[PDB]
């Protein structure tokens, strides 16, 4: 951007230049699209037309962001390698746009009462990043008295991705940002059932992530990383 009033496309380009080489994707949305669907308890306390960006990591993030980050780290200091790596790149967004007020909420942040600061999947949905498939998206479901948690599916990565956080730009208002529905890439009831069951009941076998066949998966190494318990992880990369 250069302008007296910065436009969404200029900002998106700048954030993408910063983040995309390192295996992230960014999707604009209005705060109102997020607040509309939510009770007052979960509302973001910003004007509705406030610009936000939903940020996710693709399979590439492991090799392009995390590995270089670990190599330049004092590994003894590190309690949360992935989170800190993502935090460093999110902080780089502030550096590329130093003139603008920016709030970042990461996916793992909670309020003192333990409620998530951002509902990542609702954000992913209204930003058109990934369709958020919920219990309500199955008519007359077979599941009875249990919690059926929802899951986002990306049209290119299927379930082989993660939502990393939201970048908010208070004072930049984009009331005419045109909304786009996420790709309904799991359209049939039978497939939504299999997807939700795979996510709620079988997530350790990975298979829910293939609910749409991906153009790219996590490598066998990245899979091994995330499925060995946190304490042994740096040993698995030989560090
Ligand atoms: C708490 C949590 C868990 C807990 C408990 C699971 C649970 N969901 O109860 C535990 C620790 C078990 C866990 C682990 C896992 N989960 Co988890 N975790 C979360 C977390 C931090 C909070 C989700 C939450 O509390 N939601 C609260 C409920 C009430 O939200 P909700 O059901 O969406 O309801 C709201 C919406 O429906 C909305 N709404 C109403 N109407 C409408 C209409 C529309 C159209 C929309 C869009 C919304 C909407 O209103 C409701 C609120 O009033 C999120 C990250 C985040 N910050 O959101 C992930 C998250 C859901 N988890 C994730 C994953 C991958 C997992 C694991 C697979 C991790 C792993 N081991 O690899 C496991 C799988 C186990 C499982 N979930 O069944 C990913 C899912 C990515 C995706 N969508 O593909 C998330 C998004 C985090 C991330 N970094 O990506 N998780
Ligand atoms: N907090 C630890 C653990 C992070 C972690 O294991 N996160 C998982 C759960 S969201 C993840 O990123 N997995 C990728 C995925 O689920 O696709 C860290 O920062 O390294
Ligand atoms: O500083 S707090 O607002 O308390 C926590 C915000 N988390 C965060 C900040 C910068 C980059 C990635 C994540
Ligand atoms: C949500 C969530 C979540 C975050 C970090 C982790 F190591 C496991 C999880 F389920
Ligand atoms: Na902060």
Short mmCIF file of C-alpha atoms and ligand atoms in Angstrom, two decimals:
data_model
loop_
_atom_site.label_atom_id
_atom_site.label_comp_id
_atom_site.label_asym_id
_atom_site.label_seq_id
_atom_site.Cartn_x
_atom_site.Cartn_y
_atom_site.Cartn_z
CA UNK A 1 0.00 0.00 0.00
CA UNK A 2 0.93 3.73 -0.37
CA UNK A 3 -2.48 5.41 -0.09
CA UNK A 4 -4.36 7.97 2.10
CA UNK A 5 -6.97 5.24 2.53
CA UNK A 6 -5.51 1.70 2.04
CA UNK A 7 -7.65 -0.67 -0.06
CA UNK A 8 -8.25 -4.38 0.80
CA UNK A 9 -6.48 -5.69 -2.36
CA UNK A 10 -3.27 -3.64 -1.65
CA UNK A 11 -3.24 -4.94 1.93
CA UNK A 12 -3.95 -8.55 0.86
CA UNK A 13 -1.07 -8.39 -1.65
CA UNK A 14 1.32 -7.11 1.03
CA UNK A 15 0.33 -9.79 3.57
CA UNK A 16 0.55 -12.50 0.88
CA UNK A 17 4.06 -11.30 -0.15
CA UNK A 18 5.01 -11.60 3.53
CA UNK A 19 3.27 -14.95 4.38
CA UNK A 20 2.69 -17.03 1.21
CA UNK A 21 6.35 -17.98 0.58
CA UNK A 22 6.25 -19.67 4.00
CA UNK A 23 3.20 -21.90 3.39
CA UNK A 24 0.32 -19.70 4.56
CA UNK A 25 -2.83 -18.47 2.88
CA UNK A 26 -4.82 -15.34 3.73
CA UNK A 27 -8.51 -14.62 3.21
CA UNK A 28 -10.22 -11.24 3.82
CA UNK A 29 -13.52 -10.87 5.66
CA UNK A 30 -15.69 -8.28 7.37
CA UNK A 31 -16.00 -8.59 11.14
CA UNK A 32 -19.80 -8.40 10.70
CA UNK A 33 -19.88 -11.71 8.76
CA UNK A 34 -18.26 -13.34 11.75
CA UNK A 35 -20.32 -11.56 14.48
CA UNK A 36 -23.68 -12.15 12.66
CA UNK A 37 -23.51 -15.91 13.25
CA UNK A 38 -22.50 -15.70 16.89
CA UNK A 39 -24.00 -14.91 20.35
CA UNK A 40 -22.86 -11.63 22.05
CA UNK A 41 -20.42 -13.71 24.15
CA UNK A 42 -18.21 -14.50 21.11
CA UNK A 43 -18.52 -11.13 19.30
CA UNK A 44 -15.41 -9.28 18.28
CA UNK A 45 -15.69 -5.77 19.82
CA UNK A 46 -14.98 -3.88 16.58
CA UNK A 47 -17.26 -2.05 14.12
CA UNK A 48 -18.93 -4.48 11.67
CA UNK A 49 -17.19 -3.22 8.49
CA UNK A 50 -13.71 -3.74 10.06
CA UNK A 51 -11.30 -5.59 7.79
CA UNK A 52 -9.94 -8.92 8.99
CA UNK A 53 -7.77 -11.65 7.48
CA UNK A 54 -8.14 -15.36 8.17
CA UNK A 55 -4.68 -17.06 8.09
CA UNK A 56 -4.09 -20.75 7.56
CA UNK A 57 -1.10 -23.02 7.14
CA UNK A 58 -0.77 -25.38 4.19
CA UNK A 59 1.34 -28.62 4.16
CA UNK A 60 4.28 -26.50 2.88
CA UNK A 61 4.51 -24.58 6.19
CA UNK A 62 6.37 -27.48 7.86
CA UNK A 63 9.31 -27.39 5.40
CA UNK A 64 9.31 -23.68 4.46
CA UNK A 65 8.57 -22.07 7.85
CA UNK A 66 9.07 -24.52 10.76
CA UNK A 67 12.36 -26.25 9.81
CA UNK A 68 14.25 -22.97 9.09
CA UNK A 69 12.76 -21.51 12.31
CA UNK A 70 14.06 -24.40 14.42
CA UNK A 71 17.53 -24.20 12.81
CA UNK A 72 17.90 -20.56 13.91
CA UNK A 73 16.35 -21.17 17.38
CA UNK A 74 17.90 -21.82 20.75
CA UNK A 75 16.01 -25.14 20.98
CA UNK A 76 16.39 -25.35 24.77
CA UNK A 77 14.22 -22.20 25.21
CA UNK A 78 11.43 -23.59 23.06
CA UNK A 79 8.25 -24.93 24.70
CA UNK A 80 5.92 -24.62 21.63
CA UNK A 81 7.79 -24.88 18.29
CA UNK A 82 4.82 -24.65 15.85
CA UNK A 83 2.98 -21.85 17.69
CA UNK A 84 6.17 -19.76 18.08
CA UNK A 85 7.12 -20.28 14.46
CA UNK A 86 3.65 -19.13 13.30
CA UNK A 87 3.86 -16.19 15.79
CA UNK A 88 7.15 -15.05 14.29
CA UNK A 89 5.61 -14.93 10.76
CA UNK A 90 2.44 -13.24 12.01
CA UNK A 91 4.73 -10.63 13.65
CA UNK A 92 6.38 -10.14 10.25
CA UNK A 93 2.94 -8.94 9.04
CA UNK A 94 3.22 -6.01 11.52
CA UNK A 95 6.69 -5.17 10.09
CA UNK A 96 5.54 -5.08 6.47
CA UNK A 97 2.61 -2.81 7.53
CA UNK A 98 4.23 -0.77 10.39
CA UNK A 99 1.96 2.27 9.84
CA UNK A 100 -1.27 0.38 10.65
CA UNK A 101 -2.84 -0.64 13.91
CA UNK A 102 -2.99 -4.43 13.91
CA UNK A 103 -4.46 -6.93 16.39
CA UNK A 104 -3.59 -10.59 15.92
CA UNK A 105 -5.55 -13.36 17.60
CA UNK A 106 -3.92 -16.77 17.31
CA UNK A 107 -6.09 -19.97 17.23
CA UNK A 108 -4.94 -21.16 20.68
CA UNK A 109 -5.63 -17.94 22.62
CA UNK A 110 -8.28 -18.15 25.35
CA UNK A 111 -10.00 -15.65 27.67
CA UNK A 112 -9.35 -16.06 31.45
CA UNK A 113 -12.62 -18.10 31.62
CA UNK A 114 -11.07 -20.49 29.01
CA UNK A 115 -13.34 -19.61 26.01
CA UNK A 116 -11.39 -19.30 22.69
CA UNK A 117 -10.68 -15.69 21.68
CA UNK A 118 -11.45 -16.58 18.06
CA UNK A 119 -13.71 -19.29 16.69
CA UNK A 120 -11.34 -20.32 13.94
CA UNK A 121 -13.70 -22.41 11.80
CA UNK A 122 -16.45 -19.80 11.74
CA UNK A 123 -13.82 -17.30 10.60
CA UNK A 124 -12.57 -19.79 7.95
CA UNK A 125 -16.07 -20.29 6.68
CA UNK A 126 -17.19 -16.62 6.28
CA UNK A 127 -13.84 -15.72 4.67
CA UNK A 128 -14.58 -18.39 2.04
CA UNK A 129 -11.38 -20.28 2.93
CA UNK A 130 -12.87 -23.65 3.89
CA UNK A 131 -16.43 -24.90 4.35
CA UNK A 132 -17.21 -25.57 8.00
CA UNK A 133 -19.17 -28.82 8.11
CA UNK A 134 -21.30 -29.08 11.26
CA UNK A 135 -23.88 -31.43 12.82
CA UNK A 136 -26.65 -29.12 11.50
CA UNK A 137 -25.36 -29.75 7.93
CA UNK A 138 -26.69 -33.32 8.18
CA UNK A 139 -30.48 -33.74 8.08
CA UNK A 140 -31.90 -36.32 10.56
CA UNK A 141 -28.47 -37.40 11.87
CA UNK A 142 -27.74 -40.86 13.44
CA UNK A 143 -25.60 -39.62 16.35
CA UNK A 144 -28.07 -39.14 19.26
CA UNK A 145 -26.87 -38.02 22.70
CA UNK A 146 -23.25 -37.01 22.01
CA UNK A 147 -21.23 -33.98 20.92
CA UNK A 148 -20.53 -34.00 17.16
CA UNK A 149 -17.77 -31.43 16.60
CA UNK A 150 -17.51 -29.61 13.27
CA UNK A 151 -14.68 -29.67 10.73
CA UNK A 152 -13.47 -27.41 7.88
CA UNK A 153 -12.49 -28.89 4.52
CA UNK A 154 -10.22 -26.91 2.18
CA UNK A 155 -10.97 -27.41 -1.60
CA UNK A 156 -7.25 -27.89 -2.46
CA UNK A 157 -5.80 -29.40 0.77
CA UNK A 158 -8.90 -31.20 2.07
CA UNK A 159 -8.26 -31.51 5.81
CA UNK A 160 -4.47 -31.24 5.35
CA UNK A 161 -4.12 -27.73 6.76
CA UNK A 162 -4.63 -25.74 9.97
CA UNK A 163 -6.21 -22.44 10.92
CA UNK A 164 -3.53 -20.23 12.52
CA UNK A 165 -5.27 -17.00 13.42
CA UNK A 166 -6.95 -13.76 12.52
CA UNK A 167 -5.31 -10.47 11.59
CA UNK A 168 -7.51 -7.48 12.45
CA UNK A 169 -7.07 -3.94 11.16
CA UNK A 170 -9.14 -1.57 13.34
CA UNK A 171 -9.89 1.80 11.70
CA UNK A 172 -9.77 0.24 8.21
CA UNK A 173 -13.41 -0.30 7.25
CA UNK A 174 -14.48 -2.15 4.10
CA UNK A 175 -18.32 -2.12 4.15
CA UNK A 176 -18.47 -3.00 0.41
CA UNK A 177 -16.16 -6.04 0.52
CA UNK A 178 -18.14 -8.60 -1.54
CA UNK A 179 -18.71 -11.93 0.37
CA UNK A 180 -17.92 -15.33 -1.08
CA UNK A 181 -19.37 -18.60 0.24
CA UNK A 182 -16.69 -21.25 0.85
CA UNK A 183 -16.56 -24.15 -1.66
CA UNK A 184 -19.13 -26.77 -0.67
CA UNK A 185 -16.68 -29.48 -1.73
CA UNK A 186 -18.31 -32.19 0.45
CA UNK A 187 -21.93 -31.78 -0.85
CA UNK A 188 -23.67 -35.16 -0.20
CA UNK A 189 -25.22 -36.17 3.15
CA UNK A 190 -23.49 -39.60 3.03
CA UNK A 191 -20.04 -37.97 2.64
CA UNK A 192 -20.68 -35.35 5.35
CA UNK A 193 -21.61 -38.17 7.75
CA UNK A 194 -18.41 -40.08 6.89
CA UNK A 195 -16.41 -36.84 7.26
CA UNK A 196 -17.84 -35.91 10.68
CA UNK A 197 -17.52 -39.49 11.95
CA UNK A 198 -13.90 -39.60 10.73
CA UNK A 199 -13.14 -36.34 12.52
CA UNK A 200 -14.92 -37.09 15.81
CA UNK A 201 -14.21 -40.81 16.16
CA UNK A 202 -11.15 -41.72 14.05
CA UNK A 203 -8.99 -38.55 13.69
CA UNK A 204 -5.83 -40.45 14.72
CA UNK A 205 -5.94 -42.41 11.44
CA UNK A 206 -5.81 -39.10 9.36
CA UNK A 207 -8.47 -40.31 6.89
CA UNK A 208 -11.02 -37.49 7.48
CA UNK A 209 -8.49 -35.13 5.87
CA UNK A 210 -8.96 -37.00 2.57
CA UNK A 211 -12.73 -36.21 2.47
CA UNK A 212 -11.74 -34.27 -0.58
CA UNK A 213 -8.69 -35.72 -2.31
CA UNK A 214 -5.90 -33.19 -1.75
CA UNK A 215 -3.44 -31.83 -4.30
CA UNK A 216 -0.91 -32.01 -1.46
CA UNK A 217 -0.71 -33.85 1.91
CA UNK A 218 1.56 -33.50 4.91
CA UNK A 219 4.74 -35.51 4.15
CA UNK A 220 5.38 -38.79 6.06
CA UNK A 221 7.83 -36.79 8.19
CA UNK A 222 5.25 -34.07 9.04
CA UNK A 223 2.73 -36.80 9.83
CA UNK A 224 5.31 -38.53 12.06
CA UNK A 225 6.07 -35.20 13.75
CA UNK A 226 2.46 -34.43 14.72
CA UNK A 227 1.65 -37.99 15.83
CA UNK A 228 4.66 -38.52 18.10
CA UNK A 229 4.09 -36.90 21.57
CA UNK A 230 5.42 -33.28 21.96
CA UNK A 231 8.45 -34.21 24.15
CA UNK A 232 10.21 -36.43 21.54
CA UNK A 233 9.47 -34.23 18.49
CA UNK A 234 12.80 -32.38 18.17
CA UNK A 235 14.65 -35.74 18.42
CA UNK A 236 12.57 -37.03 15.45
CA UNK A 237 14.03 -34.22 13.28
CA UNK A 238 17.52 -34.96 14.70
CA UNK A 239 18.06 -31.70 16.58
C1 LIG B 1 -11.39 -26.90 21.97
C2 LIG B 1 -10.77 -27.52 20.72
C3 LIG B 1 -10.45 -28.98 20.75
C4 LIG B 1 -10.66 -29.82 22.01
C5 LIG B 1 -12.13 -30.27 22.20
C6 LIG B 1 -12.86 -30.62 20.89
C7 LIG B 1 -14.17 -29.84 20.79
N1 LIG B 1 -14.41 -29.24 19.61
O1 LIG B 1 -14.95 -29.78 21.74
C8 LIG B 1 -9.65 -30.97 21.82
C9 LIG B 1 -8.42 -30.73 22.71
C10 LIG B 1 -10.25 -32.36 22.10
C11 LIG B 1 -9.27 -30.78 20.34
C12 LIG B 1 -8.57 -31.61 19.64
C13 LIG B 1 -8.86 -31.80 18.24
N2 LIG B 1 -9.40 -30.80 17.38
CO1 LIG B 1 -9.48 -28.95 18.05
N3 LIG B 1 -9.53 -27.16 18.67
C14 LIG B 1 -10.40 -26.74 19.66
C15 LIG B 1 -10.56 -25.20 19.54
C16 LIG B 1 -9.36 -24.57 20.29
C17 LIG B 1 -11.86 -24.61 20.08
C18 LIG B 1 -13.12 -25.02 19.35
C19 LIG B 1 -14.26 -24.66 20.26
O2 LIG B 1 -14.08 -24.63 21.47
N4 LIG B 1 -15.42 -24.35 19.70
C20 LIG B 1 -16.59 -24.04 20.50
C21 LIG B 1 -17.85 -24.46 19.78
C22 LIG B 1 -19.09 -24.04 20.60
O3 LIG B 1 -17.88 -23.85 18.48
P1 LIG B 1 -18.88 -24.35 17.30
O4 LIG B 1 -19.23 -25.79 17.52
O5 LIG B 1 -18.25 -23.93 15.98
O6 LIG B 1 -20.23 -23.50 17.54
C23 LIG B 1 -20.34 -22.15 17.06
C24 LIG B 1 -20.64 -22.11 15.59
O7 LIG B 1 -21.51 -23.20 15.25
C25 LIG B 1 -21.39 -20.81 15.42
N5 LIG B 1 -22.44 -20.90 14.38
C26 LIG B 1 -23.77 -20.91 14.61
N6 LIG B 1 -24.46 -20.96 13.44
C27 LIG B 1 -23.56 -20.98 12.43
C28 LIG B 1 -23.70 -21.03 11.03
C29 LIG B 1 -22.56 -21.02 10.22
C30 LIG B 1 -22.72 -21.09 8.72
C31 LIG B 1 -21.19 -20.97 10.85
C32 LIG B 1 -19.96 -20.99 10.00
C33 LIG B 1 -21.07 -20.92 12.25
C34 LIG B 1 -22.23 -20.92 13.05
O8 LIG B 1 -21.99 -20.52 16.68
C35 LIG B 1 -21.51 -21.44 17.68
C36 LIG B 1 -21.12 -20.67 18.93
O9 LIG B 1 -22.29 -20.08 19.46
C37 LIG B 1 -10.41 -25.00 17.99
C38 LIG B 1 -9.56 -23.77 17.57
C39 LIG B 1 -10.39 -22.48 17.71
N7 LIG B 1 -9.77 -21.43 18.21
O10 LIG B 1 -11.55 -22.43 17.37
C40 LIG B 1 -9.79 -26.32 17.59
C41 LIG B 1 -9.86 -26.97 16.20
C42 LIG B 1 -11.36 -27.12 15.88
N8 LIG B 1 -9.27 -28.27 16.37
C43 LIG B 1 -8.69 -28.72 15.35
C44 LIG B 1 -8.22 -30.09 15.24
C45 LIG B 1 -7.52 -30.51 13.96
C46 LIG B 1 -8.42 -30.98 16.27
C47 LIG B 1 -7.61 -32.31 16.36
C48 LIG B 1 -7.73 -33.14 15.06
C49 LIG B 1 -6.13 -32.00 16.71
C50 LIG B 1 -5.18 -33.17 16.42
N9 LIG B 1 -4.99 -34.03 17.40
O11 LIG B 1 -4.60 -33.28 15.33
C51 LIG B 1 -8.32 -32.99 17.52
C52 LIG B 1 -9.52 -33.83 17.00
C53 LIG B 1 -10.47 -34.23 18.13
C54 LIG B 1 -11.84 -33.62 17.92
N10 LIG B 1 -11.92 -32.29 17.82
O12 LIG B 1 -12.81 -34.34 17.90
C55 LIG B 1 -8.64 -27.69 14.24
C56 LIG B 1 -9.64 -28.09 13.12
C57 LIG B 1 -9.20 -27.64 11.72
C58 LIG B 1 -10.29 -27.97 10.69
N11 LIG B 1 -11.48 -27.38 10.85
O13 LIG B 1 -10.04 -28.75 9.75
C59 LIG B 1 -9.04 -26.37 15.00
C60 LIG B 1 -9.90 -25.41 14.16
C61 LIG B 1 -7.74 -25.65 15.47
C62 LIG B 1 -6.77 -25.30 14.32
N12 LIG B 1 -5.61 -24.77 14.69
O14 LIG B 1 -7.04 -25.51 13.14
N13 LIG B 1 -9.73 -29.62 19.83
N1 LIG B 2 1.93 -26.22 21.04
C1 LIG B 2 2.81 -27.15 20.33
C2 LIG B 2 1.96 -28.22 19.63
C3 LIG B 2 1.25 -27.65 18.39
C4 LIG B 2 0.49 -28.74 17.67
O1 LIG B 2 0.82 -29.92 17.75
N2 LIG B 2 -0.56 -28.33 16.96
C5 LIG B 2 -1.29 -29.22 16.10
C6 LIG B 2 -2.77 -29.25 16.50
S1 LIG B 2 -3.77 -27.93 15.78
C7 LIG B 2 -1.07 -28.91 14.62
O2 LIG B 2 -0.61 -27.83 14.27
N3 LIG B 2 -1.33 -29.92 13.77
C8 LIG B 2 -1.49 -29.73 12.34
C9 LIG B 2 -2.87 -30.21 11.88
O3 LIG B 2 -3.72 -30.55 12.74
O4 LIG B 2 -3.11 -30.22 10.65
C10 LIG B 2 3.68 -26.41 19.33
O5 LIG B 2 3.50 -25.18 19.19
O6 LIG B 2 4.56 -27.05 18.68
O1 LIG B 3 0.29 -10.44 22.97
S1 LIG B 3 -1.20 -11.11 23.12
O2 LIG B 3 -2.17 -10.24 22.52
O3 LIG B 3 -1.53 -11.29 24.51
C1 LIG B 3 -1.23 -12.59 22.37
C2 LIG B 3 -1.26 -12.40 20.86
N1 LIG B 3 -0.65 -13.52 20.18
C3 LIG B 3 0.18 -13.32 19.15
C4 LIG B 3 0.85 -12.09 19.00
C5 LIG B 3 1.71 -11.89 17.93
C6 LIG B 3 1.90 -12.91 16.99
C7 LIG B 3 1.22 -14.13 17.14
C8 LIG B 3 0.37 -14.33 18.22
C1 LIG B 4 -6.82 -27.33 19.51
C2 LIG B 4 -5.89 -27.74 19.67
C3 LIG B 4 -4.62 -28.29 19.89
C4 LIG B 4 -3.51 -27.45 19.99
C5 LIG B 4 -2.25 -28.01 20.21
C6 LIG B 4 -2.10 -29.40 20.32
F1 LIG B 4 -0.84 -29.95 20.53
C7 LIG B 4 -3.21 -30.24 20.21
C8 LIG B 4 -4.47 -29.69 20.00
F2 LIG B 4 -5.56 -30.52 19.90
NA1 LIG B 5 0.12 -8.67 21.55
#
